[PDB]
Design a protein around this ligand. Structure first.
Ligand SMILES: OC[C@H]1O[C@@H](O[C@H]2[C@H](O)[C@@H](O)[C@H](O[C@H]3[C@H](O)[C@@H](O)[C@H](O[C@H]4[C@H](O)[C@@H](O)[C@H](O)O[C@@H]4CO)O[C@@H]3CO)O[C@@H]2CO)[C@H](O)[C@@H](O)[C@@H]1O
Ligand SMILES: OC[C@H]1O[C@@H](O[C@H]2[C@H](O)[C@@H](O)[C@H](O[C@H]3[C@H](O)[C@@H](O)[C@H](O[C@H]4[C@H](O)[C@@H](O)[C@H](O)O[C@@H]4CO)O[C@@H]3CO)O[C@@H]2CO)[C@H](O)[C@@H](O)[C@@H]1O
Ligand SMILES: OC[C@H]1O[C@@H](O[C@H]2[C@H](O)[C@@H](O)[C@H](O[C@H]3[C@H](O)[C@@H](O)[C@H](O[C@H]4[C@H](O)[C@@H](O)[C@H](O)O[C@@H]4CO)O[C@@H]3CO)O[C@@H]2CO)[C@H](O)[C@@H](O)[C@@H]1O
Ligand SMILES: [Cl-]
Ligand SMILES: [Cl-]
Ligand SMILES: [Cl-]
Ligand SMILES: [Mg+2]
Ligand SMILES: [Mg+2]
Ligand SMILES: [Mg+2]
Lengths: 336, 336, 336
């Protein structure tokens, strides 16, 4: 009841962590602070609140991924509805856990403000993604203060999937979206310059083409891409044609800036939770990996969860799904 | 509690309706899809929640209006406080009823986002009208999706009465208001191009004069006017002088665009709920009808409710008030 | 439950007050309506809700200040969290009391919308200060309507302390802040032109220098300054050097406009609640008073409360603190 006695916030204790290199942006690539080229390779897990509700929010989940799936990265998709439901303090308290767990295993975190829609009009694909410019600024202000000088937390993914859904959510406008991303970047950099902001384009984070002529005018950033199988629609389905379409929409970005494909994956058209644009016969697997390997692109597969689709696992014993078994072997081999 | 299992929204079932012509805009008039000129003539009823609270939300209300009062149109003034209080899902569920009832009787609906104030500053005449740009966009996004390809729902009245109340609510600015209406129109047209947006000017939807030089730059729209008796203030009270003042503020619009007078009416200065600007000795009745008949203007009288003023009815047995008896005979004769 | 029966607001009854001169702006000074030069000299008390919670919201508090401390002014720092917690109606009801108490004692009120942060981005130093542009407009709309033509309420301090905290809250931008203050001023002046708006600059209301080239383009305003001891940081701590630095940041304003230092004070570096920028050995006391007396600057010391720091009193028996005893004698002598 005494609002005047509500404490000012605290910062994560950097001394609680074991030594871990910082990742940074240099030209079109990520490097570690030993100067060696770095690639984020890993997975999304579900929202922290979803996992807590079935007691699945545990270090054992991070251990499974690091020890058996070859990941060096986990993406945490923080859904705004969950942020509000747990409340900032409780949610950050659990992010703290993820930081200690990831640090101990030598892996990195992407913190993703996981909304879908058009932030300038504050209209969204679904209420679970509902937010405001104000709440979005405040999330990043709180996150940047708390995790200042923390190497484990490597990437701040500002807004998961910008889309206007055919302009039903607003009129998509690059200038307006660019300015808003630059405004978030300035808030972040005023508080911690060692973090990497990750910026997304339109069409559910698929279309980076506006940066050919109007890139975000800030250094040290990377760009997101969500190249699901059915985004590119060539008439003849083969490597060359998919490669050319990927090149035009997002791939070109990797020539100049680092790119993280923070969501990608597939399930069979008659498989679990099959929906556009993630339906595929499986050939997309080797194709997207070949393309990303050629261009040096980083990635986090969606999703290491047995309820959310497309799944990487069929149960909480970690039985791999089709795409799970595929990506698991890709990541284990890349780690070698 | 499982926010991730909240369903995506559904659309009204168009097959549940009996055949009914669409109304559309052609030049300065409305036509039906048989190509015949159409005029909206009817009434406002009270907010859906108000009616539900005294069990007055019933098909029998629509039957009374269609069978005995000569209406082809009902305006539903959806008050934002009621939208929030029932919640969108429950409110839309009741709008669905109104659609089936209206369809069955061959009459049409105007859906009116019933706020009073200045949306660009989000300041209002009374808390019952309180809203935000965000909530307003979301209302229209939900409405347009749900009632796609539904002929019964003919008009989307974006914001009932713009006013700054002497600039106490903000600085009235046509450019800013025009742009915001165009932004709502684009959201709407991206989702359903068969609906007619209705746009209002300042001075509680009375002053359309800014459209002489700066009309909304979108096709297929109509303009609202709320020509209450005391809005025009001629020194000599007669047909000619009122006609000239109405001509300058709003009437001229009917030469180029269709106009719906979505609120109008009077009560005696010593009558029930008598207040500026609705006080009149009764001579306004024949005068506004003559003027509207001359210019082809559509209208919905305020209000077919015995509690809200000025009333068209004294009780829920539909005993006509002065203005009720007047307009009832006008509408019955026009129907012939 | 009947939202349609929620009453429209009422205005403070001016006939309940005893006769009291209005204060107004003329050039760089305040005058009373007898034409005599006026200086606001007094104190802040704590937020109304804080005082109510320990039954300290009482006329006896105002009597103590007027009869024994030589004040002609009390600043009420209305914290947005408290405004929401009591609710507008209950909060205004208590402001009404303050008005009657102050009027009876012949003293004046500064109503201060007591937030700290950057309103254009709606990001703040602490949640107790959290607000929005919408809530801020609405507060001033309600305040101006209610206290129309009330002499006792002399100053409307629009936003206590603008700051971006190193641009962690947003990019500080004078043009944007100037425009927003002008927008609030226009809402206020449309409703009551007899009140004095008080505008603040950046760096927690310390830096008025942008008004050298871009002053708020409205008449009848005054400017705020919060010249805490440690704001100016001369290497050699003496009158001349502090005076020059105060001159450059805020003092110059008093040559052209009236200035109220609505927050100032000190405590010993090892005293109660000692924090930057209020730590001082006591020499700031005579120095800031000399400077303000030279320039004709008005002031309200922070804070006449035994819990909030730096205190003017050690207990609710009004035992003076160091700064309390100092300012008490300054104000008693100035009153003579
Ligand atoms: O996290 C909660 C929830 O997530 C579910 O997965 C989401 C995905 O996170 C999201 O990327 C996906 O977005 C789809 C969208 O649904 C499609 O409608 C849209 O389709 C586009 C297509 O991309 C275009 O190429 C095509 O031409 O047009 C259509 C639009 O008509 O594509 C985007 C991605 O690009 O939505 C998913 C769910 O709807 C999980 O499945 C669920 O289990 C989780 O609980
Ligand atoms: O729906 C809830 C509630 O509605 C009540 O009716 C509302 C009307 O819906 C609304 O149009 C009306 O607005 C008035 C406003 O009150 C007047 O102050 C204003 O007066 C203007 C005038 O129009 C100008 O011409 C004149 O020069 O200046 C004055 C301003 O000083 O006029 C507008 C309409 O133009 O407000 C009504 C109630 O206040 C029902 O009466 C009630 O029963 C319902 O519950
Ligand atoms: O009302 C509730 C609460 O108030 C507390 O007092 C507040 C003051 O009202 C407020 O003015 C003060 O703001 C400080 C801020 O805390 C400092 O961080 C900041 O320091 C600046 C400095 O001013 C610059 O000159 C310097 O160069 O940089 C630093 C920034 O790093 O200075 C501002 C004022 O200028 O905050 C106080 C509390 O934090 C009461 O103390 C408390 O009891 C009440 O409950
Ligand atoms: Cl898009
Ligand atoms: Cl107006
Ligand atoms: Cl600042
Ligand atoms: Mg970091
Ligand atoms: Mg329709
Ligand atoms: Mg006053």
């Amino acid at each position: 009841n005494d609002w005047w006695d509500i404490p000012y916030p605290s910062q994560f204790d950097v001394k609680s962590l074991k030594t871990q290199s910082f990742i940074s942006v240099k030209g079109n690539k990520f490097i570690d602070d030993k100067g060696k080229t770095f690639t984020f390779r890993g997975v999304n897990i579900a929202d922290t609140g979803k996992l807590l509700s079935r007691n699945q929010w545990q270090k054992s989940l991070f251990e499974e991924l690091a020890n058996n799936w070859g990941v060096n990265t986990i993406r945490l998709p923080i859904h705004p509805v969950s942020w509000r439901k747990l409340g900032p303090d409780v949610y950050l308290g659990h992010i703290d856990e993820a930081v200690r767990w990831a640090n101990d295993l030598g892996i990195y975190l992407i913190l993703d403000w996981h909304s879908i829609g058009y932030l300038p009009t504050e209209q969204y694909q679904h209420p679970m993604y509902d937010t405001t410019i104000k709440e979005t600024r405040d999330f990043w202000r709180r996150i940047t203060f708390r995790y200042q000088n923390v190497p484990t937390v490597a990437v701040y993914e500002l807004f998961n999937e910008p889309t206007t859904m055919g302009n039903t959510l607003g009129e998509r406008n690059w200038a307006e979206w660019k300015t808003l991303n630059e405004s978030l970047i300035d808030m972040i950099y005023a508080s911690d310059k060692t973090v990497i902001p990750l910026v997304a384009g339109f069409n559910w984070a698929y279309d980076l083409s506006p940066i050919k002529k109007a890139p975000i005018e800030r250094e040290g950033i990377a760009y997101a891409a969500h190249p699901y199988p059915q985004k590119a629609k060539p008439e003849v389905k083969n490597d060359k044609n998919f490669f050319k379409l990927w090149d035009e929409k997002w791939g070109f970005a990797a020539d100049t800036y680092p790119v993280i494909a923070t969501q990608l994956g597939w399930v069979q058209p008659d498989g679990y939770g099959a929906h556009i644009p993630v339906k595929d016969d499986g050939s997309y697997g080797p194709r997207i990996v070949k393309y990303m390997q050629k261009k040096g692109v980083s990635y986090t597969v969606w999703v290491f969860d047995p309820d959310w689709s497309p799944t990487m696992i069929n149960d909480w014993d970690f039985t791999p799904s089709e795409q799970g078994a595929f990506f698991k072997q890709v990541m284990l081999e890349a780690k070698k």
